[PDB]
Amino acid sequence: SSLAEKDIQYQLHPYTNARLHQELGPLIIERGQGIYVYDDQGKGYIEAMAGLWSAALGFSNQRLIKAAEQQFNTLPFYHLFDHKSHRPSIELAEKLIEMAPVPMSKVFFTNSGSEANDTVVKMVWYLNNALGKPAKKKFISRVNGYHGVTVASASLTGLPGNQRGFDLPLPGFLHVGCPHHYRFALAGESEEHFADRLAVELEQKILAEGPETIAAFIGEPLMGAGGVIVPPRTYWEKIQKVCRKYDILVIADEVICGFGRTGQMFGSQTFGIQPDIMVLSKQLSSSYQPIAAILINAPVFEGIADQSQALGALGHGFTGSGHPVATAVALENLKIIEEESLVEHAAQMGQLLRSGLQHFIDHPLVGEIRGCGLIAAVELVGDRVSKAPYQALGTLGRYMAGRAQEHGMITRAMGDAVAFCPPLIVNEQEVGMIVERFARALDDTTQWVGPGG
Amino acid sequence: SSLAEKDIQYQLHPYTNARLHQELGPLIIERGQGIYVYDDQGKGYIEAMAGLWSAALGFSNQRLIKAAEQQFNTLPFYHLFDHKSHRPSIELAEKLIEMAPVPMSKVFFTNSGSEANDTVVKMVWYLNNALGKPAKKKFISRVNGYHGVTVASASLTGLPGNQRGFDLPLPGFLHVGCPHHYRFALAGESEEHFADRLAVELEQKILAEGPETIAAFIGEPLMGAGGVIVPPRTYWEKIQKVCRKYDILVIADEVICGFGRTGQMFGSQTFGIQPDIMVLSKQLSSSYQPIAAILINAPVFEGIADQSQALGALGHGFTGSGHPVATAVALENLKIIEEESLVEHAAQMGQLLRSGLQHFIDHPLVGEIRGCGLIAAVELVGDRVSKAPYQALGTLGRYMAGRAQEHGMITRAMGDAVAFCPPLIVNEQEVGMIVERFARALDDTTQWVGP
Ligand SMILES: *Cc1c(COP(=O)(O)O)cnc(C)c1O
Ligand SMILES: *Cc1c(COP(=O)(O)O)cnc(C)c1O
Numbered sequence A: 001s002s003l004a005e006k007d008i009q010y011q012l013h014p015y016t017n018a019r020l021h022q023e024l025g026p027l028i029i030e031r032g033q034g035i036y037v038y039d040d041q042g043k044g045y046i047e048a049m050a051g052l053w054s055a056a057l058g059f060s061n062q063r064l065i066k067a068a069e070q071q072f073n074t075l076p077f078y079h080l081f082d083h084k085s086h087r088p089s090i091e092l093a094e095k096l097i098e099m100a101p102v103p104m105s106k107v108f109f110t111n112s113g114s115e116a117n118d119t120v121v122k123m124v125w126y127l128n129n130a131l132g133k134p135a136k137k138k139f140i141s142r143v144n145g146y147h148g149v150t151v152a153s154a155s156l157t158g159l160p161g162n163q164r165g166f167d168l169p170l171p172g173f174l175h176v177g178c179p180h181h182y183r184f185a186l187a188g189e190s191e192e193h194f195a196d197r198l199a200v201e202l203e204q205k206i207l208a209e210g211p212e213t214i215a216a217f218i219g220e221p222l223m224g225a226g227g228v229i230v231p232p233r234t235y236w237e238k239i240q241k242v243c244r245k246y247d248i249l250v251i252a253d254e255v256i257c258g259f260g261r262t263g264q265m266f267g268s269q270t271f272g273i274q275p276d277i278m279v280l281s282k283q284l285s286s287s288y289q290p291i292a293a294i295l296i297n298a299p300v301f302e303g304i305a306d307q308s309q310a311l312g313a314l315g316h317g318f319t320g321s322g323h324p325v326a327t328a329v330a331l332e333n334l335k336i337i338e339e340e341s342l343v344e345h346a347a348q349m350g351q352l353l354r355s356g357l358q359h360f361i362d363h364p365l366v367g368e369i370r371g372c373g374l375i376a377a378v379e380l381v382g383d384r385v386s387k388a389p390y391q392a393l394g395t396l397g398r399y400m401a402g403r404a405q406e407h408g409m410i411t412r413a414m415g416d417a418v419a420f421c422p423p424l425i426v427n428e429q430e431v432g433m434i435v436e437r438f439a440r441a442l443d444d445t446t447q448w449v450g451p452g453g
Numbered sequence B: 001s002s003l004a005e006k007d008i009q010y011q012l013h014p015y016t017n018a019r020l021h022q023e024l025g026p027l028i029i030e031r032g033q034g035i036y037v038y039d040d041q042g043k044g045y046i047e048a049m050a051g052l053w054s055a056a057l058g059f060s061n062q063r064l065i066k067a068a069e070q071q072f073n074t075l076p077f078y079h080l081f082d083h084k085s086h087r088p089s090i091e092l093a094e095k096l097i098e099m100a101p102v103p104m105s106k107v108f109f110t111n112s113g114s115e116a117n118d119t120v121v122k123m124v125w126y127l128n129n130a131l132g133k134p135a136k137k138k139f140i141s142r143v144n145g146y147h148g149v150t151v152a153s154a155s156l157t158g159l160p161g162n163q164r165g166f167d168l169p170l171p172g173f174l175h176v177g178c179p180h181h182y183r184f185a186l187a188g189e190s191e192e193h194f195a196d197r198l199a200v201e202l203e204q205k206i207l208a209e210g211p212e213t214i215a216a217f218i219g220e221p222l223m224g225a226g227g228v229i230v231p232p233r234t235y236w237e238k239i240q241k242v243c244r245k246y247d248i249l250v251i252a253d254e255v256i257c258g259f260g261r262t263g264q265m266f267g268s269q270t271f272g273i274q275p276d277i278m279v280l281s282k283q284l285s286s287s288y289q290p291i292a293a294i295l296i297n298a299p300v301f302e303g304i305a306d307q308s309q310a311l312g313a314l315g316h317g318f319t320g321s322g323h324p325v326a327t328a329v330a331l332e333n334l335k336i337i338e339e340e341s342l343v344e345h346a347a348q349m350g351q352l353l354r355s356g357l358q359h360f361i362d363h364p365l366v367g368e369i370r371g372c373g374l375i376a377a378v379e380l381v382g383d384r385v386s387k388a389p390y391q392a393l394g395t396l397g398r399y400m401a402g403r404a405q406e407h408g409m410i411t412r413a414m415g416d417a418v419a420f421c422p423p424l425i426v427n428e429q430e431v432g433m434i435v436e437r438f439a440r441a442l443d444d445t446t447q448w449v450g451p
Helices: A003-010 A018-024 A062-074 A087-099 A113-130 A191-209 A235-245 A267-271 A298-310 A324-339 A342-358 A395-406 A428-449 B003-010 B018-024 B062-072 B087-099 B113-130 B191-209 B235-245 B267-271 B298-310 B324-339 B342-358 B395-406 B428-449
Strands: A027-033 A036-039 A044-047 A106-110 A138-142 A173-176 A214-219 A249-253 A277-280 A292-296 A366-372 A375-380 A417-420 B027-033 B036-039 B044-047 B106-110 B138-142 B173-176 B214-219 B249-253 B277-280 B292-296 B366-372 B375-380 B417-420
Touching: A003 A027, A003 B087, A018 B298, A027 B087, A044 A428, A062 A324, A062 B027, A062 B062, A087 A106, A087 A292, A087 A324, A087 B003, A087 B027, A106 A113, A113 A214, A113 A249, A113 A277, A113 A292, A113 A298, A113 B113, A138 A191, A173 A191, A191 A214, A191 A235, A214 A235, A235 A249, A292 A298, A298 B018, A324 A342, A342 A366, A342 A375, A342 A428, A375 A395, A375 A428, A395 A417, A395 A428, A417 A428, B003 B027, B044 B428, B062 B324, B087 B106, B087 B292, B087 B324, B106 B113, B113 B214, B113 B249, B113 B277, B113 B292, B113 B298, B138 B191, B173 B191, B191 B214, B191 B235, B214 B235, B235 B249, B292 B298, B324 B342, B342 B366, B342 B375, B342 B428, B375 B395, B375 B428, B395 B417, B395 B428, B417 B428
Parallel strands: A138 A173, A138 A214, A214 A249, A249 A277, B138 B173, B138 B214, B214 B249, B249 B277
Antiparallel strands: A027 A036, A036 A044, A106 A292, A277 A292, A366 A375, A375 A417, B027 B036, B036 B044, B106 B292, B277 B292, B366 B375, B375 B417
């Protein structure tokens, strides 16, 4: 049996057509260094997605590898249950709280973003029970938001591909509009007026459901998996005013935006969000270890703490919560981002990326170029006036991602948008190569379509 | 300022009274080796729980540490999304399928047991939708079952401490009886007759709810966190007959029983279970890495595969699913358990543990001694005839666990029971020291409850 045949025989792949997988088999990645990964045929690819929006320090950071080794040789596993603790969880929790963009009280650790959002749902239910508000339990999120894949976090998620066939969302998980001007604004509507309508939609939803029943609003500062969607100017200001009016918690899902992706340390800084709760993962450890973190502010902690006393202990925890190797690696990761000034470097590299893409702004298949900091997307269309796809929605995106791979670059299609989320350590020449490989994929796609006109 | 002050300032602890934590602060564990961990004062403890039922190879296995290093220096992160793959996920998946106690088709990887059970819930809903059985969605689990802490997996969990204040269980998550003879059998009732009644209870629950609405039955072969509860003889045989009668999937939650804990490689082998789906974690990697695995049989895979084609792709996955470092470490872990014959060693050490504990069978505070393989529990009671607690359920267990810690042993209280789940590598004299530290804690507890 080849390694590819064993993969087909034995693995059910996430986010894969399992039948198509049996026909095509895997693309096997063997090794990585810097921004590059290599398949088992020796072909090199720029990982323009940093794997899953996540590998901040690239694929061969020796400081993270040595930090793991040092913690393995000290204490390779322990837990935080029943007052037990360990230095790496303590020092990471200190660093996260002290770097938070708003006053935060406590950190709770999980393995995944999905577990973290699932945990926030439980914590908000627990909190509102503690405060004697037992009706105050519904969550509001957005169409095309991504918050993970547990039964509860896939209910916060607003992407239909995460819900169809899974009987989701659960009751009590509500969705308001995707704040994407290009796709959902009225013809000739300003960003500010689009923001007004989205804030009216949220308030009308709160009033229709009964304000006393709405616990929390959750949003990525800018939406990652849903299309690299930058919210319209004044959106977050106007949404937060509605939330504060009805005593609704604001949860910033920073799993992608966290640690320098958007031009500042946090998306909450870039977009002027004052969240009660923040969720962090992915770049937290450059994904070298599975870890996520929840930051809760004083009011959330105090109500949870009170009830944990009344009921004996907080009845919640994962075996891996605060895992000493995962926390040790994340701690070293955050030190490197600070010591190497990678927030500012990412901002400078993002200006080069966006300038490079904008040479194609009048291309007949380029509908929108969006992003900020070191996250971007190009949304392709078959027709710029109607914004209609070429053939089925997703055709151009899939074709572009296929061509990008052939030209030695891994991007991700989100319908007809192709994403860019390179490692923060990407250098100026490397940004040049990412845009060159985009241009080659676009040329191939243009020849395949034949736009004429 | 001190590390303890920083912990109090910055960390919300799982499974902790947060207010008592602000007063007492943490017990900081600095380092581990073999079956031992050490606090920041240099005091050594036998980790009689292997951390969280999990550290099979103990706290200083150099082969796991080198396996991590080697994978880190090759490919420290990649994913399995959109047909991407990597060698350690492939070779671990191969090994898990080829070692499975019943024919299995595919492995799906997660970080946690909770994520894995949450994923099984979604897979069963997805499957029954694919098969055109949209009503076939309810799960049956058991009182005192532990299946993790997500909104959905805490609904499978049957421990009130996991549900009170969290508005759980969700609708469609049903519970039948805890198969604990000592607590739930009628006067003079045999194990076999207790099993008969539990099988009737399950069938009656299925008929009351409508069989066409029941998707799955999930059980730990023996219940870990809920009390180290060994099911009565013939339970699993009779429960499976009921499940097969109504076309209900049998899910074996092997997160604690997996990889030699119960005297054989799997709890499904020890208890004669033929599951459709198995869930594995904890000893999978000796918890050196967060990883869990779901094994699905051919019919579950075929229905999910068909739906994943109809819907374009399987719309499910964690960033960490099959993480190359976590999979490389788990693969090496399973090789060590096989190469070092730790299943047979654990069985031999478990006989010593259980015989050592059995000397306390006539102690006036010992209500029951239970276990199987290298997992055991001693349940304390304030009165052996009535089986009543002292003051309130949990009072004895809390005090016992605290005294065990003072005598250099970390155990875990499950109400008034203290658990034993030592690393598989524990030696004979180390089992003797576990029983001695238990005995010292029991003496302390006896004097504390007093005359
Ligand atoms: C990736 C992601 C998650 C889920 O994290 P996992 O570790 O994959 O479960 C949640 N929210 C956002 C915004 C994400 O991008
Ligand atoms: C520990 C455990 C789980 C949950 O695993 P986590 O990794 O802690 O989420 C599930 N089932 C059983 C039987 C367990 O013992």
